[PDB]
Design an enzyme around this catalytic site. Structure first.
Site, PDB file in Angstrom:
ATOM      1  N   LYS B 343     -92.577  52.585 -21.619  1.00  0.00           N
ATOM      2  CA  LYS B 343     -93.469  51.788 -20.784  1.00  0.00           C
ATOM      3  C   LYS B 343     -94.353  50.879 -21.628  1.00  0.00           C
ATOM      4  O   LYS B 343     -94.554  49.706 -21.287  1.00  0.00           O
ATOM      5  CB  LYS B 343     -94.324  52.705 -19.914  1.00  0.00           C
ATOM      6  CG  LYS B 343     -93.518  53.617 -19.004  1.00  0.00           C
ATOM      7  CD  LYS B 343     -94.371  54.739 -18.440  1.00  0.00           C
ATOM      8  CE  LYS B 343     -94.508  55.888 -19.422  1.00  0.00           C
ATOM      9  NZ  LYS B 343     -93.252  56.678 -19.528  1.00  0.00           N
ATOM     10  N   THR B 344     -94.890  51.399 -22.732  1.00  0.00           N
ATOM     11  CA  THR B 344     -95.795  50.608 -23.558  1.00  0.00           C
ATOM     12  C   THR B 344     -95.102  49.385 -24.143  1.00  0.00           C
ATOM     13  O   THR B 344     -95.677  48.291 -24.143  1.00  0.00           O
ATOM     14  CB  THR B 344     -96.370  51.473 -24.677  1.00  0.00           C
ATOM     15  OG1 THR B 344     -96.985  52.638 -24.115  1.00  0.00           O
ATOM     16  CG2 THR B 344     -97.400  50.696 -25.478  1.00  0.00           C
ATOM     17  N   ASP B 397    -103.331  51.233 -21.488  1.00  0.00           N
ATOM     18  CA  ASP B 397    -102.193  52.125 -21.640  1.00  0.00           C
ATOM     19  C   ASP B 397    -102.665  53.560 -21.828  1.00  0.00           C
ATOM     20  O   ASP B 397    -103.749  53.813 -22.360  1.00  0.00           O
ATOM     21  CB  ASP B 397    -101.323  51.711 -22.828  1.00  0.00           C
ATOM     22  CG  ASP B 397    -101.964  52.038 -24.155  1.00  0.00           C
ATOM     23  OD1 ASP B 397    -103.191  51.841 -24.285  1.00  0.00           O
ATOM     24  OD2 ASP B 397    -101.245  52.490 -25.070  1.00  0.00           O
ATOM     25  N   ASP B 398    -101.829  54.498 -21.387  1.00  0.00           N
ATOM     26  CA  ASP B 398    -102.116  55.925 -21.481  1.00  0.00           C
ATOM     27  C   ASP B 398    -103.429  56.256 -20.767  1.00  0.00           C
ATOM     28  O   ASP B 398    -104.412  56.701 -21.359  1.00  0.00           O
ATOM     29  CB  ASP B 398    -102.147  56.371 -22.947  1.00  0.00           C
ATOM     30  CG  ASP B 398    -100.862  57.049 -23.374  1.00  0.00           C
ATOM     31  OD1 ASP B 398    -100.360  57.906 -22.618  1.00  0.00           O
ATOM     32  OD2 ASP B 398    -100.353  56.725 -24.467  1.00  0.00           O
ATOM     33  N   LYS B 425    -112.144  46.201  -9.408  1.00  0.00           N
ATOM     34  CA  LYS B 425    -112.422  45.421  -8.208  1.00  0.00           C
ATOM     35  C   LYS B 425    -113.519  44.386  -8.430  1.00  0.00           C
ATOM     36  O   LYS B 425    -113.967  43.764  -7.458  1.00  0.00           O
ATOM     37  CB  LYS B 425    -112.794  46.355  -7.045  1.00  0.00           C
ATOM     38  CG  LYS B 425    -114.164  47.006  -7.160  1.00  0.00           C
ATOM     39  CD  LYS B 425    -114.431  47.951  -5.993  1.00  0.00           C
ATOM     40  CE  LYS B 425    -114.575  47.227  -4.664  1.00  0.00           C
ATOM     41  NZ  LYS B 425    -114.895  48.175  -3.559  1.00  0.00           N
ATOM     42  N   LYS B 502     -86.185  56.828 -26.317  1.00  0.00           N
ATOM     43  CA  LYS B 502     -86.857  57.303 -27.522  1.00  0.00           C
ATOM     44  C   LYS B 502     -86.269  58.631 -27.987  1.00  0.00           C
ATOM     45  O   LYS B 502     -85.991  58.822 -29.182  1.00  0.00           O
ATOM     46  CB  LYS B 502     -88.353  57.438 -27.243  1.00  0.00           C
ATOM     47  CG  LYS B 502     -89.227  57.618 -28.469  1.00  0.00           C
ATOM     48  CD  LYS B 502     -90.696  57.666 -28.068  1.00  0.00           C
ATOM     49  CE  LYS B 502     -91.610  57.852 -29.264  1.00  0.00           C
ATOM     50  NZ  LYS B 502     -93.028  58.053 -28.855  1.00  0.00           N
TER      51      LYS B 502
HETATM   52  N1  LIG Z   1     -84.835  48.650 -23.983  1.00  0.00           N
HETATM   53  C1  LIG Z   1     -85.928  49.233 -24.488  1.00  0.00           C
HETATM   54  N2  LIG Z   1     -86.995  49.405 -23.680  1.00  0.00           N
HETATM   55  C2  LIG Z   1     -88.089  49.987 -24.179  1.00  0.00           C
HETATM   56  N3  LIG Z   1     -88.303  50.449 -25.412  1.00  0.00           N
HETATM   57  C3  LIG Z   1     -87.232  50.266 -26.189  1.00  0.00           C
HETATM   58  C4  LIG Z   1     -86.032  49.680 -25.818  1.00  0.00           C
HETATM   59  N4  LIG Z   1     -85.147  49.659 -26.884  1.00  0.00           N
HETATM   60  C5  LIG Z   1     -85.819  50.221 -27.857  1.00  0.00           C
HETATM   61  N5  LIG Z   1     -87.087  50.611 -27.511  1.00  0.00           N
HETATM   62  C6  LIG Z   1     -88.059  51.262 -28.382  1.00  0.00           C
HETATM   63  O1  LIG Z   1     -88.253  52.557 -27.886  1.00  0.00           O
HETATM   64  C7  LIG Z   1     -89.479  53.052 -28.463  1.00  0.00           C
HETATM   65  C8  LIG Z   1     -90.127  53.928 -27.419  1.00  0.00           C
HETATM   66  O2  LIG Z   1     -91.093  53.188 -26.645  1.00  0.00           O
HETATM   67  P1  LIG Z   1     -92.550  53.747 -26.404  1.00  0.00           P
HETATM   68  O3  LIG Z   1     -93.053  54.485 -27.578  1.00  0.00           O
HETATM   69  O4  LIG Z   1     -93.440  52.592 -25.954  1.00  0.00           O
HETATM   70  O5  LIG Z   1     -92.375  54.706 -25.155  1.00  0.00           O
HETATM   71  P2  LIG Z   1     -93.321  55.355 -24.052  1.00  0.00           P
HETATM   72  O6  LIG Z   1     -92.467  55.609 -22.812  1.00  0.00           O
HETATM   73  O7  LIG Z   1     -94.542  54.556 -23.846  1.00  0.00           O
HETATM   74  O8  LIG Z   1     -93.649  56.764 -24.693  1.00  0.00           O
HETATM   75  P3  LIG Z   1     -94.529  58.058 -24.399  1.00  0.00           P
HETATM   76  O9  LIG Z   1     -93.733  58.833 -23.352  1.00  0.00           O
HETATM   77  O10 LIG Z   1     -94.519  58.837 -25.713  1.00  0.00           O
HETATM   78  O11 LIG Z   1     -95.892  57.669 -23.944  1.00  0.00           O
HETATM   79  C9  LIG Z   1     -90.315  51.804 -28.771  1.00  0.00           C
HETATM   80  O12 LIG Z   1     -90.309  51.691 -30.187  1.00  0.00           O
HETATM   81  C10 LIG Z   1     -89.442  50.643 -28.275  1.00  0.00           C
HETATM   82  O13 LIG Z   1     -89.462  49.672 -29.311  1.00  0.00           O
END
Ligand SMILES: Nc1ncnc2c1ncn2[C@@H]1O[C@H](COP(=O)(O)OP(=O)(O)OP(=O)(O)O)[C@@H](O)[C@H]1O
Ligand SMILES: Nc1ncnc2c1ncn2[C@@H]1O[C@H](COP(=O)(O)OP(=O)(O)OP(=O)(O)O)[C@@H](O)[C@H]1O
Lengths: 16, 534, 124
Positions: B343-344, B397-398, B425, B502
């Site tokens: 998501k981030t 975020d978070d 708001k 991830k």
């Molecule tokens: N198609 C994709 N979409 C999103 N992230 C991707 C993609 N391909 C590779 N990545 C990489 O996957 C990694 C995981 O993303 P990220 O750490 O933002 O996940 P998150 O869902 O926010 O994690 P968390 O659950 O730990 O809060 C990032 O380094 C991102 O660069």
């Protein structure tokens, strides 16, 4: 209340 | 004439300060240029003061000395910092009056048709500070300030003097002195812009081009593009560093220093030196405002399925709506999904794709050990900064980590929640637009707190579901050969899978540690044992 | 020279006043080996160093040390050898007939490394 700490001083010279 | 005959704007080598110099000339020198008859007809008085201030290394001293050179009059008097203090009593005032004695004498002797005298004060804050708010060790400073105030504007009227003062902390100066009649015009010098950064770079490179010592591959426009938030001093330092790097290649030191002198007469500066210097030698003193998108996006983005494109399109639509609307100056959106979905990274990409002047990201990584008040203050500061620009975009975020949530009891901080609910708001000032993007991993918890209704729309971020998507992702990463791909397909194609990207990367990296004859097996087990999920 | 770079006024650090900013940190293994070689040149030149001393072993062993600590280690090792020819029981007396043929052995270095010098960084 904690009492104010110590302070330095500045001096001025006079000529006779 | 009062102006040197050969003077012109181009010769002083100033950078991008066109507006400020024009304002000075308008508000300070207009009266002295017109014929005496009309100015006498109006019967208006003349300015006598100027106060330049700004961050270090902008050109204040350069501007002051150039103004001094421009005017044809007596050699300007310079007071170099706190050189006027003396230990004997009453002698500081002696100097502060000796400075003005000559101008007083000339005005007395010739009257209204006398010449002009210019006095330059440097580091004024050292001498002049608030009389009441000062050290009690000695009243010397107060007497000095009173003497200066009396001399500049006292019972006797003096009208052929101009005083220039430069500082860095305008707040400390006494209020009684910054009033009309002593110093009414008060400018602020700031960092230049792209055009100013181009003009400055041009002013220094001139001689190298003149003597054909600069390689043709150098593009000044590109350099001006890269150098963001730099100042004139830093630009000159960058030029000097590139010059030194180019020069260093004709000396053999480290045992005994020598110079070629026959292969050293064909010197030239390439673009490589500038690139090297821009990463090793010169860093901007003012912290770079551009976010470090590399940290948040550490492995790029790969199109393994339609949902990525769908999410990006929705983000683009929201950006367009917030850009081209007037009934709804404020918009909000929430991204939600299972953990390890990315998501981030997607939020950061959506923010980057827009070209808004102001972009910032608020994360809990910086708020470690902070109390429940420090967080509120930080968020307030960020939003206050965002309010200034015409168009603003902010990312939070978070959220659950920002509220200190724990499922036992449960526990959380109420003050942060209330601050967020109020800031979601609050419309910005008139004629400005703001966008907010929020990220979270637990939607039901937010629903319980009754903040899910505060947002305007929601976007879902899924994780890999079918074996075909897994095969496509493996192909895109290209970490296995065709034989291994067939072996994996023969099993995975039968059923469905449920894993985040991830975790997939972590599993691949863990698997690649085994010997070639085992890796594939090591992979499958890791997918089977951990893959138990809907 | 300073130990607290972040307390200095910013106006003094802009280009044109103090440009070249440098950080001096702890050495790596090669730096430790070079430093150790520097401070033992005279003894080798004058044949006061025993043949069983291996510099590379010391360089590998001495972790997290700095230049001052290496010099102190060498200095303590030198004194442990000088002390074997002195008698401080009642009146301080020197042999002067066995002082010649003074030599520094590996045992002196080992002993000095366990009871005299201790680094002020990391785990040990
Ligand atoms: N198609 C994709 N979409 C999103 N992230 C991707 C993609 N391909 C590779 N990545 C990489 O996957 C990694 C995981 O993303 P990220 O750490 O933002 O996940 P998150 O869902 O926010 O994690 P968390 O659950 O730990 O809060 C990032 O380094 C991102 O660069
Ligand atoms: N606008 C500019 N155009 C050209 N050169 C500039 C400009 N600004 C700075 N420089 C270069 O940087 C040097 C530093 O500028 P200057 O000495 O005028 O700064 P200052 O604001 O008076 O300094 P401080 O606040 O640190 O006392 C100038 O001498 C010139 O070399």
């Amino acid at each position: 209340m904690a009492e104010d700490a110590d302070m330095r001083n500045e001096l001025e010279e006079m000529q006779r | 004439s009062i102006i040197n005959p050969d003077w012109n704007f181009e010769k002083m080598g100033i950078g991008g300060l066109d507006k400020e110099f024009s304002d000075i000339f308008r508000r300070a020198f207009a009266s002295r240029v017109f014929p005496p008859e009309i100015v006498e007809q109006m019967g208006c008085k003349h300015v006598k003061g100027i106060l330049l201030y700004g961050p270090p290394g902008c050109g204040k001293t350069l501007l002051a000395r150039q103004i001094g050179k421009m005017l044809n009059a007596r050699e300007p008097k310079v007071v170099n910092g706190p050189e006027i203090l003396n230990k004997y009593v009453g002698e500081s005032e002696a100097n502060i009056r000796k400075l003005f004695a000559d101008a007083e004498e000339e005005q007395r002797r010739l009257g209204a048709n006398s010449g002009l005298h210019i006095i330059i004060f440097d580091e004024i804050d050292a001498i002049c500070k608030q009389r009441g708010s000062m050290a009690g060790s000695t009243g010397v400073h107060d007497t000095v300030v009173n003497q200066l105030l009396s001399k500049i504007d006292g019972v006797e009227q003096l009208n052929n003097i101009l005083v220039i003062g430069m500082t860095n902390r305008p707040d400390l100066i006494d209020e009684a002195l910054l009033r009309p009649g002593r110093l009414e015009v008060k400018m602020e010098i700031g960092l230049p812009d792209e055009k100013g950064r181009l003009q400055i770079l041009h002013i220094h490179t001139a001689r190298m081009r003149g003597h054909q010592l600069l390689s043709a591959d150098v593009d000044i426009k590109e350099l001006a593009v890269e150098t963001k938030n730099f100042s004139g001093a830093e630009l000159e330092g960058l030029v000097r560093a590139a010059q030194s790097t180019a020069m260093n290649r004709h000396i053999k030191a480290s045992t005994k220093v020598e110079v070629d002198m026959e292969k050293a007469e064909s010197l030239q500066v390439t673009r490589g030196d500038f690139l090297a210097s821009l990463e090793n030698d010169i860093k901007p003193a003012f912290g770079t405002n551009q976010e470090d998108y590399a940290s948040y996006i550490m492995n790029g983005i790969i199109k393994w399925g339609d949902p990525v494109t769908r999410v990006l399109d929705d983000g683009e639509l929201l950006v367009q709506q917030t850009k081209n609307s007037d009934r709804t100056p404020l918009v909000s959106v929430l991204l939600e999904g299972p953990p390890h979905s990315g998501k981030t990274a997607l939020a950061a990409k959506i923010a980057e794709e827009s070209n808004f002047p102001f972009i910032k990201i608020c994360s809990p990584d910086k708020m470690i050990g902070f109390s429940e008040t420090a967080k509120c203050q930080a968020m307030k500061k960020i939003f206050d900064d965002a309010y200034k620009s015409q168009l603003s975009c902010v990312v939070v975020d978070d959220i659950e980590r920002l509220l200190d949530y724990v499922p036992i009891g449960p526990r959380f901080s109420n003050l942060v929640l209330q601050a967020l609910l109020v800031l979601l708001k609050k419309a910005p000032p008139q004629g400005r637009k703001l966008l907010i993007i929020g990220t979270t991993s637990r939607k039901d918890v937010l629903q319980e707190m009754e903040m899910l209704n505060a947002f305007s729309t929601t976007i879902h971020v899924p994780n890999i579901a079918t074996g075909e998507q897994l095969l496509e992702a493996l192909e895109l990463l290209g970490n296995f050969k065709d034989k291994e791909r067939t072996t994996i397909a023969q099993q995975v194609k039968g059923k469905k899978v449920w894993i985040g990207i991830k975790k997939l990367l972590m599993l691949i990296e863990m698997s690649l540690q085994m010997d070639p004859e085992y890796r594939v097996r090591k992979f499958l087990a890791l997918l089977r044992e951990e893959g138990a999920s809907p």
